[PDB]
Amino acid sequence: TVPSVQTFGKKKSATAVAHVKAGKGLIKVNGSPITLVQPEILRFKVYEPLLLVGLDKFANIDIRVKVTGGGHVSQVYAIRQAIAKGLVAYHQKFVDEQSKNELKKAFTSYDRTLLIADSRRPEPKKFGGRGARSRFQKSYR
Amino acid sequence: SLVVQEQGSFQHILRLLNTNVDGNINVVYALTTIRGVGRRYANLVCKKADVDLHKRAGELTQEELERIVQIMQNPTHYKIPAWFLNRQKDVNDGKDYHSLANNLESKLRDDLERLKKIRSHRGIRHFWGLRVRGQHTKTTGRRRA
Amino acid sequence: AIISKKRKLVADGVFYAELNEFFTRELAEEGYSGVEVRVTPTKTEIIIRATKVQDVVGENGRRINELTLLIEKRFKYKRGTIALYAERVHDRGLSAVAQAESMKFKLLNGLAIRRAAYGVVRYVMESGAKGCEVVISGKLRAARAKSMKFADGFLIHSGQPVNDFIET
Amino acid sequence: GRVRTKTVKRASKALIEKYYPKLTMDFQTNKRLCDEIATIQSKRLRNKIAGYTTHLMKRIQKGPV
Amino acid sequence: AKHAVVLDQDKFDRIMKEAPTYRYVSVSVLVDRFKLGGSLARVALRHLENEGIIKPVSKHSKQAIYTRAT
Amino acid sequence: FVPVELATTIPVEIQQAQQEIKLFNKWSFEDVEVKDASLVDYIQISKPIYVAHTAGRYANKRFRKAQCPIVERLTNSLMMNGRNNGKKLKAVRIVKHTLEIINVLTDQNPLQVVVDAIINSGPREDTTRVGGGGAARRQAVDVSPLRRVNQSIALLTIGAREAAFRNIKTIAETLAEELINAAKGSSTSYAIKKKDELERVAKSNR
Amino acid sequence: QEVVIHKIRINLTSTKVKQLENVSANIIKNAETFKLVKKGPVRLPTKVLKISTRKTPNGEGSKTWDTYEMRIHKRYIDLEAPAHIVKRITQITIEPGVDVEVIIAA
Amino acid sequence: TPVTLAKVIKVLGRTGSRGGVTQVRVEFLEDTTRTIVRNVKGPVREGDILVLMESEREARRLR
Amino acid sequence: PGVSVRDVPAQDFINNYASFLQRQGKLEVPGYVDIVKTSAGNELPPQDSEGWFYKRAASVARHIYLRKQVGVGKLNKLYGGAKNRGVRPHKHVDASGSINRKVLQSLEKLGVVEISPKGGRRISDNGLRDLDRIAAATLEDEE
RNA sequence: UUAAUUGCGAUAACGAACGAGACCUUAACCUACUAAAUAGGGUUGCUGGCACUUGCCGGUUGACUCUUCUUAGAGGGACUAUCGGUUUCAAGCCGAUGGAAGUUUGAGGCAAUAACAGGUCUGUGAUGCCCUUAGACGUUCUGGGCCGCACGCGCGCUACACUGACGGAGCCAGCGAGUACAACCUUGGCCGAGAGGUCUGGGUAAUCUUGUGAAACUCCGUCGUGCUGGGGAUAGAGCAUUGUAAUUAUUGCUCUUCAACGAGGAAUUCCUAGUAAGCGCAAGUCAUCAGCUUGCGUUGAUUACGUCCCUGCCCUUUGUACACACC
Ligand SMILES: [Mg+2]
Ligand SMILES: [Mg+2]
Ligand SMILES: [Mg+2]
Ligand SMILES: [Mg+2]
Ligand SMILES: [Mg+2]
Ligand SMILES: [Mg+2]
Ligand SMILES: [Mg+2]
Ligand SMILES: [Mg+2]
Ligand SMILES: [Mg+2]
Ligand SMILES: [Mg+2]
Ligand SMILES: [Mg+2]
């Protein structure tokens, strides 16, 4: 019934699903709040989308996320991309478009992907080597 | 926790079990210096003394050293499970025992003799001064004892 | 049975690939090409494509009824659930294996090797091939080995248009 | 290294030959115009044909060739 | 060994006199004054945050920077 | 100003350092103008970013390495050596502490010292080996200008790692000192000495 | 008179896709004619079977490899329908290659 | 240290026996319109700036 | 308002839980304290040694709060790590079997852990009370 | 120009095929369809605790409904697209904008003509002819042996630590794979410091193992730059496990031993992006063994984005007493 959007986020193979809602201002992840995350240095990278647009947008908008796959710094980036879309999808739906443009302008000037879904997936580790490109070590001595 | 107040300077070495207990540093790692003790055994011993591992313990009390030495001598009397030992299961039908100092190096030389007496595939390889535990020295280690 | 889906389907593929190679060795005289094994409930239709269909059938249930019982004794089955049908090939030239076993026989019997290839190529062009080839190798006279190559038309070697088009 | 192949350039030459009309400058139109007329099996090849047709149209504005 | 590991009351007093009015305060910069060894300096850093006197900047394990109470 | 109540409670110190100013991690990112052409529009403080870490598709085109923040390049160059290859998290932590050292060091914005360090350590003219018949004559060639930036960035973190090996002095304590020595043109650091070494090598081969 | 719904699951597992998808379309079209409550053609993850192998017999020359693999397409068509209507939908809609199979027990 | 601050006008091809050197014509910042073709070590774009000690000494294609 | 467990970071929580256990001293002892490896790859036993186990059971408690039904092996596997196996490369092996079982058995008697159906253990009524109070206490220390 | 005999263009050549490309498979995007209690969420029931107001976290296959994520069908989508220069204003290249994707979009898969005395008669009831054909060089048992070591090179691993080591604590992946005629993966519970036993299950597998809560990582402490707590080799003894059989330690674990080695000379390998490097997992072989390997995901830079200086190859012109072709 309430105005809501289900904004996903992705990096490498990490997958965060940020549900947004109307209320006081929850921004939770797997039950735990925004404030934890717990790689700890990249707490501020998940604060980045909030501080750019402002805390005022979260007085109405109530976010809640559930993350699966990938690793730590990927899931940070999964959350982070689930958050930035969370606002834009809400401001597109139930608020003016000039604000949503002002979001995108602020996101694009400080663009660390954020809105843009990241492209990079892993090259297969094809044979004749340890990794993908990385070959073995020939000898002629 | 506490920096060393009071005059201090209570002996740098410190001899124990005919071997050199290094001053300052730590009990555990002064014990490792003794011929026969390692890191996990010495940390086991420090528990029974009830001394802090944070303390340097070259300024130890003499009664505490006498406990430690007795713990080295007797495994079975004290709370030591008796397969945490250097040697275990030896002679005919009886008990496990170990040493940790000049007593151990002598015990090792006695067990090396025991191996030489039996003339086993291990003991024969000790006579040669070569590779006991079926390891290939086709390539590796071209210097040797 | 029951086994895992991933192990059944590989055992089915094996079973087929065993059958395929048996019928290559056993039906050499009949001019066999390939099997098409269908597995429905109760019955299983083991269709066998071959040139000399009258020789595969024999005289109204004779060689096929020997082979059905052989398949049952290999793979534990009962009578009724296996059923053989020997059909003709829709244009023999298009199928490569048919021509392979013809070239096999022509060499075995006694014929000019070059002309044996040229005759079979012309047949394939008459049947309706955009292109064709025959490689024949080993020692076609003399001690030292050679390859010998006889061909016609557009031959695609690369790409996927290969599994689709070129019967090898 | 985007140099369009022969078949691309061969068809697109024969396409604009027969259909100078029914080719509005822009791609998506000319793309749908290509799949109508010529019978391409691929998707990419068809898109790549359409890609050259356009480049032929855009030259056509600046004189002949 | 290069010495500067031995603990004394004379060395205890010099550390307290060498504490206040000091920009950099860390495990390295104490040891750079030929002081008590890495951890003994690290413990000495811990005492200098008992009741102010030197206040913290960073809190990390080994990257433990402090500065005087302004 | 204006701490808005979000259900998931944020600390008071964090809510203050937000919105009003486009800061770095805690302190401001502004100022730090170079006033030396060649390094302007490459050593870019003009691009404000809040953490020294991105995914950053910079290694793709050619001059997208210039648009990358200078702080990330320092975490990036700090990742050298196979023990520490990958692991930005650690390097970002180290970059955090170097800046905190400089904040304590005679006040001053720490990014100013970071940028002032890179400017001095960048070589003016570097020699490249020419064939020229057979012998190893080296013509003096001009360095331009990401190459000055890129070599200086490595030169700095090489001074850090060389000091760091068998040493109490933490990579941040070493790097910060290398930045300090490079800001106040002293020629005691490894980055400045190696700049001086080539210069010198440039004058000799002209 | 009966109308006893046993809840029957249909198993479709096979290599070929264009047959399988056509088979799966044929059963749902039969369900639409017989008008039953049924969950649609569910599509389970494709178990890809990877046999890694050196191309050589001899183990000489360069060390080349061939991932000889097998595609598998595991599908489901769950029926909330009686026993007799399942006996009909087993008799018809049988194509070659695709492994039609019935669980029958909820 | 008398430094001459130089600025690029045209990259005159990639030169040298090896790949890592470039001939580039230079219109220096102060006192403009005195064009000199001097070599370059690293990556270049039009309108870039060059720091160097020794300015008025024109370089040729390296053997 | 509304107080919760997660708002307190896990580091400070387990310390506050450890101190809470030291104040009671009724968590119980296993019988192998400091005569024990903890992980089957680990050259040195716990350095804190005395205490320690109170931090351990606090950790198992908060893990069992967060998860649905955690048993012994899953803890072993979680708490395990890298063997310094030699000149050979590393491997993962699950931590000591019994100690984690003695952590669970002790937490069952206190009333932190409750036995769950299907497979494993879940949380009691009175266990959830101490978790929330310790969460409230650490939040007051931050403020 | 192109990665390309890829194309423009000039043109005794014109239009063609093969190879390249196209194709194929996979990896990238869809709040646009079709779908789910073997994939996940929302309300609500019962129910656990909190602050105690309405609010927060839950736990339940109790209901109802949804398909964003998930799978995976069917489609589309990128065409160097639009703009700018730049280039006989060609082929194309270069920079911005948007766009999931602007490196042939990424990676492979197939891969021509002609061959090579490359390798394989130790994958082969694929095989010619020399071998042999019962004292068999057949088969089969039983014990060894391939693993021996003054010593040469060749892939590899672990390190020479303080970007660390050791403790705890935090704690997030993907490829996978797995037994009913056997003995597979094996949670959950008890015993054991371990290894490992045992009862019991679940699973022929998006269902159970399994979120394979893997490692490196992140936090707080111990040691501080000493062959030190770095480094683990060599050793002794025991406790386990596989197998009929373990000494020429099968492997694991226990405690003890603490050797060499303070970043490696001449040389030379690999590499241009989710790559290198790190890290672990994974199946393969396997009763038992991982430093191996084909896959996988995690952390993720540096530096070109050029040139023919070396190396190799390719053409082209030239020469050639060569054509079994510089052996
Ligand atoms: Mg072709
Ligand atoms: Mg191709
Ligand atoms: Mg190690
Ligand atoms: Mg490709
Ligand atoms: Mg040969
Ligand atoms: Mg033979
Ligand atoms: Mg061998
Ligand atoms: Mg190899
Ligand atoms: Mg699974
Ligand atoms: Mg040692
Ligand atoms: Mg070659």
Q: Please provide the CATH number assigned to the domain covering A1-141.
A: 3.30.230.10
Tokens in use for F186? 């002293």
Which residue is listed with tokens 């066999």?
A: C32
Cβ-count burial of D58 within 10 angstroms (0-12 exposed, 13-18 middle, 19+ buried)? exposed
Q: Are A120 and F55 in contact (CB under 8 A)?
A: yes
- β-pairing, G99-102 with G8-13? antiparallel
For chain I, the domain total comes to 1
Instruction: Tokens for I10, please give them.
Output: 């896990």
User: Å between B143 CA and J151 C1'?
Assistant: 11
Are the beta carbons of C45 and G97 closer than 8 angstroms? no
Q: How far apart are CA F163 and CA F174, in angstroms?
A: 7
Report the alpha-carbon distance of residue F86 to residue F63 in Å, rounded: 23
Contact F181, F189 (CB under 8 A): yes
- Identify the CA nearest to E24 among candidates B20, I49, F98: F98
Domain E1-70 has CATH 1.10.1050.10: no
- CA separation (Å) from F69 to A41, C51, F115? 17, 75, 11
Residue A3 CB coordination number (10 Å): 13
Quick check: B5 and E12 CB within 8 A? yes
SS3 content of chain C, % helix, strand, coil (to 5): 40, 25, 35
Length of chain B: 145
Residues in chain H: 63
E45: Cβ–Cβ under 8 A, 6 or more apart, which residues?
Answer: E25, E26, E27, E30, E54, E64, E66
Spatial distance from the CA of C20 to the C1' of J217 (Å): 55
Give Cβ neighbours of residue F169 (< 8 Å, ≥ 6 apart). E28, E32, F163, F177
Closest CA to B57 of B36, B37, B80, B31: B31
For residues E15 and B3, the answer to whether their CB atoms sit within 8 Å is yes
The DSSP bridge pattern shows strands C82-87 and C44-50 to be parallel
CB atoms within 10 A of CB I122: 16
Q: Binding residue per annotation — B138?
A: yes
Distance from CA of F44 to the nearest CA of A (A): 14
Q: Based on the number of CB atoms within 10 Å of its own CB, is I121 exposed (0-12), middle (13-18) or buried (19 or more)?
A: buried
| Domains by residue range for chain D, with CATH | 1-61 (1.10.60.20)
Task: Round to whole Å and give the CA distance between F86 and F79.
Answer: 6
Contact I61, I32 (CB under 8 A): no
- Answer whether I87 touches B (CB < 8 Å): no
Chains C and E lie in contact, requiring 3 or more CB pairs less than 8 Å apart? no
The one-letter amino acid at E3:
H
Tokens of F33: 């103008």
Distance I79 CA to J170 C1' (A): 11
Backbone phi and psi for residue H40, each to the nearest 5 degrees, phi listed first: -145, 140
Give dist(CA G50, CA G42) in Å, integer: 24
CA distance C28 to C46: 18
DSSP state of F132: T
Inter-residue contact G24 to G16 (CB < 8 Å)? no
Nearest to I84 by CA among I124, I40, I114: I40
DSSP class of residue B18 equals: T
Of the listed ligands, the closest to the CA of G62 is 8
DSSP 3-state of G13? strand
Quick one: tokens of G46?
């494709």
**Which positions on chain J have an atom < 7 Å from some protein CB?**
1-4, 6-9, 16-24, 26-31, 34-38, 40-42, 48-52, 55-61, 68-74, 76-83, 89-96, 98, 100-115, 117-120, 122-124, 147-181, 187-197, 201, 204-206, 209-211, 213-239, 247-250, 252-258, 262-263, 269-281, 284, 290-309
**Helix (DSSP H) and strand (DSSP E) numbers for chain A:** 3, 5
Listed by start position, the domains of chain E span 1-70
**C22 lies in which domain range?**
1-90
Question: Which positions ≥6 away from D56 have C-beta within 8 Å?
Answer: D12, D13, D16, D65
Burial track C111-140 (b if 16+ CB lie within 10 A, e otherwise): eebeebbebbbeebeeeebeebbbebeeee
From the alpha carbon of F63, which nucleotide's C1' atom is closest? J305
Nucleotide closest to residue A9 (CA–C1'):
J69
Whether residue D16 is preceded by a cis peptide bond, meaning omega within 30 degrees of 0, is: no
CA–centroid distance for A128 within its chain: 36
The region that residue B39 occupies, defined by phi over 0 for left and psi between -120 and 50 for alpha, beta otherwise, is: alpha
3-state secondary structure string across chain H: CCCEEEEEEEEEEECCCCCCCEEEEECCCCCCCCCEEEEECCCCCCCCEEEECCCCCCCCCCC
Q: What percent of the residues of chain F are helix, what percent strand, and what percent coil, each to the nearest 5?
A: 45, 5, 50
Domain that holds residue I102: 1-143
CATH number of domain containing G8? 3.30.70.600
- Is there a contact between G48 and G69 (Cβ–Cβ < 8 Å)? yes
* DSSP assigned state of E21: S
C-alpha distance from residue F105 to each of F26, F98, F100, F191 (Å) = 17, 10, 9, 20
Q: How far apart are CA F120 and CA F195, in angstroms?
A: 8
Sign, Cα dihedral of F185, F191, F193, F196: negative
I82-94: b (≥16 Cβ within 10 Å) or e: ebeeeeeeeeeeb
F199 to H18: CB separation less than 8 angstroms, yes or no: no
CATH code of the domain containing C82: 3.30.300.20
**Which residues on adjacent β-strands are paired with residue F142?**
F125, H40
C-alpha pair distances (Å), F131 with each of C111, C154, F134, H62: 68, 52, 6, 8
Beta strand A61-68 with A14-22 is antiparallel
G8 and G82 Cβ atoms separated by less than 8 Å: no
For residue B143, what are its two tokens? 């210097």
Instruction: Give CA–CA dist F199/F142, Å, rounded.
Output: 11
Angle CA F122–F125–F129, to nearest 5: 120
Domain around G63:
1-106
In the reported structure, the alpha carbon of residue A138 is separated from the centroid of ligand 8 by a whole-number distance in angstroms of 8
Q: Does A127 touch chain G (CB under 8 A)?
A: yes
DSSP 8-state assignment for residue D16: H
φ, ψ for residue D48, nearest 5 deg: -75, -35
Domains of chain F: 1-206 (1.10.455.10)
Strands I121-123 and I113-115, sheet pairing: antiparallel
Amino acid letter at D32? R
B62: burial class by Cβ within 10 Å (0-12, 13-18, 19+)?
A: exposed
Helix, strand, or coil here: C153?
strand
What six digits make up the tokens of E64?
């433990």
C-alpha gyration radius of chain B: 19
Task: Tell whether omega for the bond before B14 is within 30 degrees of 0, i.e. cis.
Answer: yes
What span, in angstroms and rounded, lies between the C-alpha atoms of C133 and C127? 14
Q: Which residue in H has a C-alpha nearest to residue F66's C-alpha?
A: H43
Quick check: A138 contacting G, CB < 8 Å? no
Homologous superfamily (CATH) for H1-63: Nucleic acid-binding proteins (2.40.50.140)
Nearest CA in chain I to B81: I35
A14-22/A5-11 β-pairing: antiparallel
Can you give the resolution of this entry in Å? Answer: 3.6
How many beta carbons lie within 10 A of that of residue D4, not counting itself? 13
The Cα–Cα gap between A81 and A17 comes to 10
Nearest CA in chain F to I6: F8
Which ligand has the minimum distance to the alpha carbon of residue B138?
Answer: 7
User: What domains are there in chain B, each with its CATH number?
Assistant: 1-81 (1.10.8.50), 82-145 (no CATH)
- Experimental technique behind these coordinates: cryo-EM
Residues F159-198 as b/e (b if ≥16 CB within 10 A, e otherwise) read: bbbebbeeebbbbbbbbbbbbbbbbeeeeebbbbebbeeb
Residue I104, both tokens: 């669970």
Name the token pair of A1: 């019934």
Contacts of B29 in chain E (CB under 8 A): none
F108 Cβ neighbours under 8 A, 6+ residues apart: F102
CA F34 to chain centre: 14
